């Protein structure tokens, strides 16, 4: 369920991604997390229990906010608050909603702060989705094997 109002998808949602080698990679969607969350502010960090089993993380960051680079800093801080190794756990950073001109404006400073390694995407228009799939597969083949 997707909607404009915040704090949707309360229940964790699993979808799998198909590939050519008859292998499936499962991706999980949990409700939104907030800075703090250690004092049970917002929806808390109760839903974070799923992520323990998850081999790697997708840091989904919206470019609508004036400073999206601070987003990942808040995320890593809260994950540490839950469990120490989660911050050190390997991941990929993904930017969303780049169809908006303000996102395109702030893209330059994202490149300045976060770097080239971060993959930039649109969900509504499905921009640069393929690079995400490449990166998903590569991370799987990296440290999800043996």
């Amino acid at each position: 369920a997707v909607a404009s109002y915040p704090f949707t998808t309360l229940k964790p949602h699993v979808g799998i991604v198909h590939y050519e080698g008859h292998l499936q990679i499962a991706v999980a969607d949990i409700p939104g997390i907030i800075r703090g969350a250690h004092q049970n502010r917002g929806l808390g960090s109760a839903f974070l229990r799923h992520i323990e089993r998850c081999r790697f993380l997708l840091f989904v960051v919206d470019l609508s906010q004036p400073e999206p680079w601070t987003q990942v800093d808040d995320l890593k801080y809260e994950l540490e608050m839950y469990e120490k190794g989660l911050s050190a756990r390997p991941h990929a950073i993904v930017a969303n909603k780049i169809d908006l001109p303000e996102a395109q404006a702030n893209l330059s400073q994202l490149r300045d702060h976060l770097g080239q390694e971060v993959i930039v995407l649109s969900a509504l228009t499905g921009e640069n989705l393929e690079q995400l799939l490449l990166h998903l597969k590569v991370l799987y083949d990296a440290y999800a094997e043996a």
């Binding site: 369920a1 909607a3 949707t8 309360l10 229940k11 109760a46 229990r49």
Partner: peptide, 25 residues
């Protein structure tokens, strides 16, 4: 046979945590 469209608040049904006291026969 059709699946029923779900409410946003489906956390009512889905449970992740439970305290159980088990007793044998």
């Amino acid at each position: 046979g059709k699946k029923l469209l779900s409410e946003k608040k489906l956390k009512r049904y889905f449970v992740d945590y439970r305290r159980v006291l088990v007793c044998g026969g």
